[PDB]
Amino acid sequence: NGKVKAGQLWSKNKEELTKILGELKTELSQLRIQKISSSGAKLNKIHDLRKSIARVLTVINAKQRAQLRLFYKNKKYLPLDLRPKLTRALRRRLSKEDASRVLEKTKKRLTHFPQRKYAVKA
Amino acid sequence: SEKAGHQTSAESWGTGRAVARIPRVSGGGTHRAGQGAFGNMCRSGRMFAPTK
Amino acid sequence: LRSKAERQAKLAQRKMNRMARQGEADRHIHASMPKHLFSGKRTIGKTDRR
Amino acid sequence: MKVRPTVSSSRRKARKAHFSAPSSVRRVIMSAPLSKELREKYNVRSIPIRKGDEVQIVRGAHKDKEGKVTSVYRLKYVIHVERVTREKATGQTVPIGIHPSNVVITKLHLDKDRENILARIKAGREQVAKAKG
Amino acid sequence: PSHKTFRIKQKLAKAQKQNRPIPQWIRLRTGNTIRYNAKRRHWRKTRLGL
Amino acid sequence: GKAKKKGKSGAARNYMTRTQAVKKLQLSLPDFRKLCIWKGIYPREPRDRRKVNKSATASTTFYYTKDIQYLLHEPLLQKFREQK
Amino acid sequence: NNHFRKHWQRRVRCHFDQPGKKVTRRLARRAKAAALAPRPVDKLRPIVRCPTVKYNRRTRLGRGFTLEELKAAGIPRLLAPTIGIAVDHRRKNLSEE
Amino acid sequence: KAQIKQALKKLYDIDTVKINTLIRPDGTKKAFARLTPDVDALDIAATKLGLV
Amino acid sequence: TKGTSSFGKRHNKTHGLCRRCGRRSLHNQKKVCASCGYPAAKTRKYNWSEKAKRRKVTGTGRMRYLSTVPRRFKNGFRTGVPKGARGP
RNA sequence: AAACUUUCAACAACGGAUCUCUUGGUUCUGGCAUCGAUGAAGAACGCAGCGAAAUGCGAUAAGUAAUGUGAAUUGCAGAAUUCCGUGAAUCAUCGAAUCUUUGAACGCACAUUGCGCCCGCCGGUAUUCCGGCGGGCAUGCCUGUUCGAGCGUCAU
RNA sequence: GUGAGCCCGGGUCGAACGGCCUCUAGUGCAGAUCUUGGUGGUAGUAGCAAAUACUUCAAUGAGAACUUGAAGGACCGAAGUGGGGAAAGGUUCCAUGUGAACAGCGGUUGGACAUGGGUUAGUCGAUCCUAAGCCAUAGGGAAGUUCCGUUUCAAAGGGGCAC
RNA sequence: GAGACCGAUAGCGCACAAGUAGAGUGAUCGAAAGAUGAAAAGCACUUUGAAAAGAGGGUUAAAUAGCACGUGAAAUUGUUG
RNA sequence: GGGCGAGGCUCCUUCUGAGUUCCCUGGAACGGGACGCCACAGAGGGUGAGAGCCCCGUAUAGUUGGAAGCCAAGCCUGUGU
Ligand SMILES: [Zn+2]
């Protein structure tokens, strides 16, 4: 008891995950008093309760972020934590379209005189 | 390495009545303090004519 | 195992007990050749000590 | 002679890698040969050893002793075999560490993953032999 | 002194919790080279430097 | 703990005069009166009006500070500014 | 006549990377040839005569063909650098030969 | 002190008349919570806390 | 009496602890750290002390974020999850 | 004659040379381009059943998720693993997360865990009181929005 | 063997090493008040002599001048060898236990060593005020790190009323 | 990835919980320190001591390897001749 | 002017030859002797002493599975505002 697997958590929604988090936190709070009052094999249980709380928090955060990404899928401005990280310099880099933009005179020259494929007889 | 034996702050204690005039590591509170430095004859010092 | 551990803890103190340290916290390195005692000359004017 | 530029013949780097290998690498490092019967049954020469395998000791002062693997001390690069023990001073029993390259596996502790390992080793050996033949 | 700031008292708390000999089970670990606390502090020997 | 100062809690925080409310919402008086009618903000009467405002008279109008705070979020304010 | 009166030891360049740099250049040339195939790896260059009285006996390759050379050969100046011909608008043809 | 009394009420249904706090020399906080006279602290320590 | 007797009067503090670098180098009257130069925006460093530079240089601490950048570069700063991975 | 001093030898001391070893330096060569307000480098304080440090991590704290592997970890204690498996491990990889107080450090300050302001939510008898929680409030500059000022130039 | 040296026997020991011809060098020590480390004679020597001073019984303990209780004798002598604080220290405080090391003699004792415990505020301080003084802002200097500036050559904001 | 490099007083200051311990108000200064054994098999049990330990008896191929630990030079010391 | 595109390349992944045969010394063969085998692998390391064949690896063609790009033989089509 106290070991909650991620597989069962990935199918729950927010309310039962919150309820499970509440019960796990209550058991850990009682078990700390049990630790300071007596010694036993319940230290394994407190370790599993800590890791189960971590798993539940991870799953709740992941589902909330997935829902938010779905909500912000078709919007121009995203929250800064939902924006891709990359590096600061990569984010300041010119976009691919803007870097590939050429002048129209250049475009006419490239349309009518591109680099050709050729060979020279020996 | 070109910096070997020269990463120390050390000065000679001068002509006197007690010790040889090799430069000695300044400071205190450690075994290195007051010990000889920079010489090819010194422990933890620069070798004669370092290889290039 | 407790007896073995206590013996190892006592055997860990032999070098510092030979060096006569007051416990493991005593790591003071004293000046065996102080500069004020091993440099300079006593002139005819002011002296560094009486 | 090694040819590939990613291969190093440095003794220092080899010993550093060997004695600082993590646990999954140490599992591959403590491999043991199979017995002749198991080799002809599975077309497999060697496998990483594990707890529950039955081995025969073929080197050292405990040669020809047989038993089950009771522990794989990967931290000490050693395995423990049941009844291959010695007596302490106090009259208690302490296991004797045996390197897995000094034993031969006579019975495999079989599960689905071990069968997958044996099957893919056999398939690779047959494919290589067919390609080179 | 009795008058002290919170930051100073926090640093003194950390020093008090650090002031201990090593657990005896450390010496029984495989390949252990730690024999004692080489950074052990005492109030008479070495100053905290605050 | 630290000694409180006079006039920083109680009715002085509970009530606002109409002048304070209009300046707080940054509205003109016709827009404010229109919005109070439409949102049901009603005049109120403190027990001691001097504790709210020392220049208050019998004709001074008071409102709840929380009601004015609620009016801060009404979408009609941006409609007013857009029409202007 | 030894010029070692400055701190010369800070600016000594040895050349232990000479075979490595040859290998790097050969790898770059092979990559360039593979990218350019079946075109030649280089551009066609004209024949020019070296300046000064010491070297005007000898001819060598120049930078690129002149505009009047391209016009007399019937190659338009926009087509020429796309078919492996180097073009030099600065050089002029002072003589017929 | 307000956070401590709210947490005690939320966790153990404990009502306190006053709370005194100190920070121990090790760096942790210690709280003396005096309970209301109608409630028995020995009973709470026996059942809810298991301190016998 | 410029030695031992004078040394008994040493009970003040020229420097306290600096909030930026943690050393006992914050001059209590000038409010300037002698080591890191706080509260100036730049951290104090000089080319006449290679040792002092190497005591505080990048890599001598924790590299809480910078140590993970080479792995993300090696995988190309990719985003997302492996195909078919369990999750939301 | 002994003792003492000195010399020679054997054994025993003292001390750590010599020899052998080397998960370390040093030098050369080849490849690569990737820090930070989306809060870096650095600092502080914490986190393990039993750790002070080193190492790892951040109140999800010697770690969580995911992928892979496929039976450990180990100094002790305690549990394992349905072994024909949503699965051990101080395992590897690593694309999802968490990431205390700080620091260019950003409400104002900081030798103070000092003092604020704005907007929400919750609880305690509560339209006023008390408490808790969440989101915000630095500077320079650019584009734009909106509210303005001046007989500065005009129209009417 | 003239020699620098080379070779062998015996003892110890435990994992590598040598001859010959060439190649190569960080290649040969008694000195440098040489460097680092280690060790002598001096020598069981100089000394352990300021602050008036100790004694008896019992207990504890392997062991008691310097542990404890009692019994005596003294000293500080209220500008104290007393009772409390500021700076500074940081757990030295309290209880229990203790081999070595330390307490220039001893030690059962200890500020030592080991494991634990201990610091409770609306009223005491900090927190607030300003002093001498220091630092932002406007603005002006300076290649610049930055310097001056603190009321200025600043559009630097408060209140009230309104059908 | 390598070397006609160095082999723990060398080689980076650092082969080790090293930019650590320690010193300085501060800027800064800045060490020493690697090797039991193949495997802890790290000495059961008896005996003498208050204890540390000693002696028997053991482990080991070897304790002439006893967590002062490979080898174990010299200065210098003890005993025996 | 557009759209396909066989095929190729780059990166991680599954897999690869042959003695633990007999005698002697030894605490332990990885030493000595004999008889074999592999080798596009006799680099390096580990294993109780110098191991190609005990173990990891090492050589060479390939061979499983996946992702993102690039190059590219050719092939469909609009036609001149
Ligand atoms: Zn600082």
- End-to-end Cα, chain B, rounded Å: 9
Distance of I66 CA from J99 C1′ (whole Å): 14
Distance of C4 CA from L43 C1′ (whole Å): 12
Judged by C1' against the alpha carbon of A88, the nearest nucleotide is J36
Please count the CA atoms within 13 angstroms of the CA of D8 that sit on its side-chain side.
Answer: 8
I34 Cα to the center of ligand 1, angstroms: 7
Give whole-number Cα distances, F48 to F43, F61, I67, in Å: 15, 13, 66
**What method was applied to determine this entry?**
cryo-EM
Find the CB nearest G78 among A113, A119, A120: A113
Count of CB atoms situated within 10 Å of the CB of I44: 15
Compute CA H9 distance to the chain's CA centroid, rounded to the nearest angstrom.
9
A84: CB partners within 8 A, 6+ apart: I77, I79
Answer positive or negative: Cα dihedral of A70, A76, A82, A84.
positive
I15 Cα to the center of ligand 1, angstroms: 10
**Cβ–Cβ gap H11/A29 under 8 Å:** yes
H4: CB partners within 8 A, 6+ apart: H19, H21, H31, H33
Give whole-number Cα distances, D85 to D31, D72, F20, I80, in Å: 22, 15, 92, 53
Q: Which residues of A touch G84 (CB under 8 A)?
A: 118, 120
* 3-state DSSP assignment of residue F47: coil
Please give, rounded to a whole number of angstroms, the shortest distance from the CA of C11 to a CA of chain B: 26
Q: Which residues of E touch H24 (CB under 8 A)?
A: 13
Rounded Cα distance, F40 and F70, in Å: 11
E16 Cα to the center of ligand 1, angstroms: 25
CB contact at 8 A, I38 and I32: yes
Rounded Cα distance, B30 and C30, in Å: 8
**Cβ–Cβ gap A66/I69 under 8 Å:** no
Give whole-number Cα distances, D16 to D13, D25, D28, F45, in Å: 5, 13, 16, 85
Q: Which residues of I touch A84 (CB under 8 A)?
A: 77, 79
CB contact at 8 A, C48 and C36: yes
Q: Length of chain F in residues, anyone?
A: 84
A37: CB partners within 8 A, 6+ apart: H50, H51
Strands H29-35 and H16-23 come out as: antiparallel
Q: Is I13 on the interface with E (CB under 8 A)?
A: no
Strands D93-95 and D85-87 come out as: antiparallel
H19: CB partners within 8 A, 6+ apart: H1, H4, H5, H31, H32, H33, H34
What is the three-state SS of chain B? CCCCCCCCCEEECCCCCCCCCCEEECCCCCCCCCCECCCCCCCCCCCCCCCC
* 3-state DSSP assignment of residue G64: coil
Rounded Cα distance, F43 and F54, in Å: 18
* I45 annotated to bind ligand: no
Q: What angle do CA F62, F65, F70 make, to 5 degrees?
A: 120
- End-to-end Cα, chain C, rounded Å: 61
Q: Which residues of A touch I77 (CB under 8 A)?
A: 84-87, 90
Residues linked to residue B31 through DSSP beta bridges, in sequence order: none
Amino acid at D71: S
Measured in degrees and rounded to the nearest 5, phi and psi for residue G45 equal -120, 145
Ion ligand 1: residues, CB within 5 A, are I 18, 20-21, 33, 35-36, 38
CB contact at 8 A, D129 and D45: no
Q: Pick from G43, G45, G77, G82 the residue to mutate for testing the A interface (most A CBs within 10 Å).
A: G82
Count of CB atoms situated within 10 Å of the CB of G87: 19
